[PDB]
Structure 1
Amino acid sequence: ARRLYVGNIPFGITEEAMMDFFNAQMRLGGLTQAPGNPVLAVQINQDKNFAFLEFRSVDETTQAMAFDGIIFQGQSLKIRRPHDYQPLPGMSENPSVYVPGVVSTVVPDSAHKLFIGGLPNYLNDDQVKELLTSFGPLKAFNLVKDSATGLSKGYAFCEYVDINVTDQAIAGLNGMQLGDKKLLVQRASVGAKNA
């Protein structure tokens, strides 16, 4: 895929200012495979609050994914792959089925994103992040705000650099009393319990 989905983009951001930023991130990081800018175009859906990046190569696109969660103009960008990948109802389940095509040779130690809820609606990114930082530096953090309203929805996602600290972060934060709400913290995917 020579395309990437980038949501939670800054308001009023221009397509060109989205391009110049990514191309300048690809160069600073040295993630380019050949001379020239990787990002050829960017399309922004202002109302929907998202944009799509268009790369010249497939590998470069797969390299820009490392910028998921990067801070740009106070907004933590959400980078994902397009959804042109459909279930494809062609019938005769053989190249699909379920397992065939994605058996997974062996998933590496990854995915330790944490879900945080019960957060007061008045706290902002720099306040919430602080409460989380008290256990160690974060590698990715995003506070969900209403599309129109713009205020906190009451829950945010975060991931530390040192995953082990992830477990320590849940045991000390989960249940914490914030205002008139009870904080909730659990692995955003699997791991809401501890054996």
Structure 2
Amino acid sequence: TRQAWRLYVGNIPFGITEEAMMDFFNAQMRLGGLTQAPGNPVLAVQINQDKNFAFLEFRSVDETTQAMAFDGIIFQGQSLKIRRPHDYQPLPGMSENPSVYVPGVVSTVVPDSAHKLFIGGLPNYLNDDQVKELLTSFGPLKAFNLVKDSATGLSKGYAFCEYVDINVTDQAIAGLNGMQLGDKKLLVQRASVGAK
């Protein structure tokens, strides 16, 4: 099954070409020490421009798995969402999880948990990178996602995150909750408090 050689990439920059995406991933894999031989690990990229996602095709199962470590990497201001194809199943005795860490890359997977934060009231002109930088001021992030409209790509003005250090959570709340920005006022609280 070809699905062990392919990844979904969501939240791609508008107007990006398949070649630009391929060059980005091939370079990052090499610069990060993930590539396992001479030559390019990514063989092809198929972009769905209207739906805002791509699929990457890799030359090996192992390099496909390692590339999962790039989930959340910023590309032209956007956090790339890297995921397995929905019809992927690991073969027995194979780990589906990457074994290398990429410095500075913050996962987009923010599970509901004790210290998961909601940040509402963000100006909609801030991209994923700038909201991430706002939050990183308080301490390193374990995970982060800025919510966007799936049809237009515009920020919906709220995000979720998890700090590496659970104790930074209350520091970010103290520094950001109630902050006024024009007509908006930030609400920063554990996401469990106001989850619908």
TM-based fold match above 0.5: yes
Structure 1 residues 130, 29: CA separation in 2 closer, same or farther (over 3 Å shift)?
A: closer
Provide runs of 4+ in structure 1 moved above 6 Å: 86-112, 189-193
1:105 to partner: Cα distance: 24
Aligned partners of 1:94 and 1:100 also within 8 Å? no
Structure 2 partner of 1:87: 90
Structure 1: gaps (5+ residues): none
Q: Which has the larger radius of gyration?
A: 1
2-side partners of 1:12 and 1:51: how far apart? 12
Matches for 1:1-195 after TM superposition, within 5 Å:
1-85=4-88, 114-125=117-128, 128-138=131-141, 140-170=143-173, 172-174=175-177, 176-186=179-189
Secondary structure of the 1:163 match is: coil
CA displacement at 1:58 relative to structure 2? 1.9
Q: Percent identity?
A: 99
- Counterpart Cα distance in 2 of 1:163 and 1:50: 33
The verdict on how the C-alpha distance between 1:92 and 1:164 changes in structure 2, with shifts beyond 3 A counting, is closer
Shift of 1:107: 15
Higher mean alpha-carbon deviation, 2-11 vs 28-37, is at: 28-37
Answer with 62-71 or 116-125: which moved more. Answer: 116-125
Report the Cα offset of residue 191 of structure 1.
11
Shift of 1:133: 3.1
* Residue 171 to residue 43, structure 1, CA distance change in 2 (3 Å): same
Tell me how far 1:104 sits from its aligned partner. Answer: 21
- Cα offsets for 1:83-136 (capped at 9, x unmatched): 115999999999999999999999999997543223243544465345423312
Is the Cα contact below 8 Å between 1:114 and 1:185 reproduced in 2? yes
Per-residue deviation, 1:188: 5.8
Residues 42 and 111 of structure 1: CA distance in aligned 2, closer, same or farther (over 3 Å):
farther
| Cα pair 1:68 1:140 within 8 Å, conserved | no
Give the C-alpha shift of residue 12 in structure 1: 1.3
What is the RMSD of the two structures over their aligned residues, measured on CA atoms? Answer: 8.4
What whole-Å deviation, never above 9, does each CA across 1:125-160 have from its counterpart, x for those lacking one?
Answer: 465345423312446544333244443212123344
**Change in CA separation of 1:168 and 1:191 when aligned onto 2, cut-off 3 Å:** farther
1:24-76: per-residue Cα shift (whole Å, max 9, x none)? 11111111223332212111110110001111222211211111111111222
Q: Does the CA-based 8 Å contact 1:115-1:157 persist in structure 2?
A: yes
Answer whether contact 1:121 1:152 (CA < 8 A) is retained.
Answer: yes
Say whether the 8 Å CA contact 1:5–1:79 is kept in structure 2: yes
Q: CA 1:13–1:155 in structure 2 vs 1: closer, same or farther (change >3 Å)?
A: same
Q: Does the aligned pair in 1 maintain the 2:73–2:80 contact within 8 Å?
A: yes
| Contact map agreement 1:118 1:155 (CA 8 A) in 2 | yes
Q: 1:91 to 1:32 in 2, by over 3 A?
A: closer
User: Unmatched 5+ residue regions in structure 2?
Assistant: none
Shift of 1:175: 5.0
CA distance change for structure 1 residues 50 and 129 in 2, over 3 Å: closer, same or farther?
same
